[PDB]
Ligand binder design. Sequence first.
Ligand SMILES: Nc1ncnc2c1ncn2[C@@H]1O[C@H](C[C@@H](N)CC[C@H](N)C(=O)O)[C@@H](O)[C@H]1O
Ligand SMILES: [Zn+2]
Ligand SMILES: [Zn+2]
Ligand SMILES: [Zn+2]
Length: 430
Amino acid sequence: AEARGGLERFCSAGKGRGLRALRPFHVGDLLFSCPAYACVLTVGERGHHCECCFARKEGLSKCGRCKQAFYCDVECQKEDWPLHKLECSSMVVLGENWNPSETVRLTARILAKQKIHPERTPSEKLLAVREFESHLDKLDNEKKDLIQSDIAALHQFYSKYLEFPDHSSLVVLFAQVNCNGFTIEDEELSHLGSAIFPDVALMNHSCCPNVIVTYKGTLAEVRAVQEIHPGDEVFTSYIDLLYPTEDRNDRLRDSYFFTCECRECTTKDKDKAKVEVRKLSSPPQAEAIRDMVRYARNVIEEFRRAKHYKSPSELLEICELSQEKMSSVFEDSNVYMLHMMYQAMGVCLYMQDWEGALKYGQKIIKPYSKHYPVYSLNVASMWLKLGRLYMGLENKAAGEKALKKAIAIMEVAHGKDHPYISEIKQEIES
Ligand SMILES: Nc1ncnc2c1ncn2[C@@H]1O[C@H](C[C@@H](N)CC[C@H](N)C(=O)O)[C@@H](O)[C@H]1O
Ligand SMILES: [Zn+2]
Ligand SMILES: [Zn+2]
Ligand SMILES: [Zn+2]
């Protein structure tokens, strides 16, 4: 018998172990699904999504003791209890002082799961957590310090409720989480939480992926976005494909310890349109473009840092400031301009500035459609957010057209029967 029908684990030369198709898969076909081995809901979503299954529901029943964990029903509460019990009492005693990072909370759950079920689970038919690559030999000083900081935080927040393996085993585990972890995003690409999907972790990376990972609660689903021929390796993208080749590879080396050699990374064809410059009298010299690229990659970091000391209103100004400055060199379609417009849209949405968010959305959509693949969750989510803004702003004609563009991509990536599709169709009707 086949562990996963039409697929097998194999040795991909220069890429360790990988996933291969045995039979053809065509666009929109489901290769496999994988329940979460461990998952944790992001703090920001407490009271809005079930802590166990991540369902977005009104009227979630809360935990009687800590009054902090929220659930669909007693069944979700019971499934989560082995994990929630590690935090419940600590959240009662320490208030806002109990703040382990999301990665630390996830790793605590993996430790709890490993102890109870040493044998392979249904989320490990092809690759087990114990087999995950860690790359300890490639970790630099800063990366080693970060893991050590995470281990101290784990002892700090869980020592009273969780027994630990030796320090070296914890180092290996946090390192495995870094190169095999997933984040779960909703239909608008909002961050819901972090998870471990061992069989999904088997797939190698390509900047030209042939599959897309989506979620049905905490169940990961893998669907083909191009034909996958018998014998082909199955590739997902580990990163945001919007960025130029150098940016993507700096991210792949930093988190996954490899340099990509895919067709897009070899030819760099998309880089010209991604770093688009404006047609002026001059025009911009290569040195001046390099300076704006460096300014752009720094403002990305400036914005992230500013979240700690600046108000949303101020963060919006950083985005406004940057766009104005970069526009002397950069076209609106330039990816660095889009990064700032996207961040500005999120701030607008947060400050209830529906109109400001809609104007940003209207500028992002066309360049997103060009830069991203045909089936991209980033493009689908942008059409959806645009559709929802128009619908909310009493423009049903433009709203319906945008929601329909989102559904058409989502039918491929999420499957025609996905609950997100039914939800959007119910928004078109009512
Ligand atoms: N395109 C690639 N080129 C080289 N190595 C890759 C590529 N994609 C993924 N990898 C490797 O696979 C790791 C991530 C794993 N989640 C993927 C399965 C991994 N190949 C394994 O044998 O466990 C990365 O940290 C790299 O070691
Ligand atoms: Zn639930
Ligand atoms: Zn509780
Ligand atoms: Zn690549």
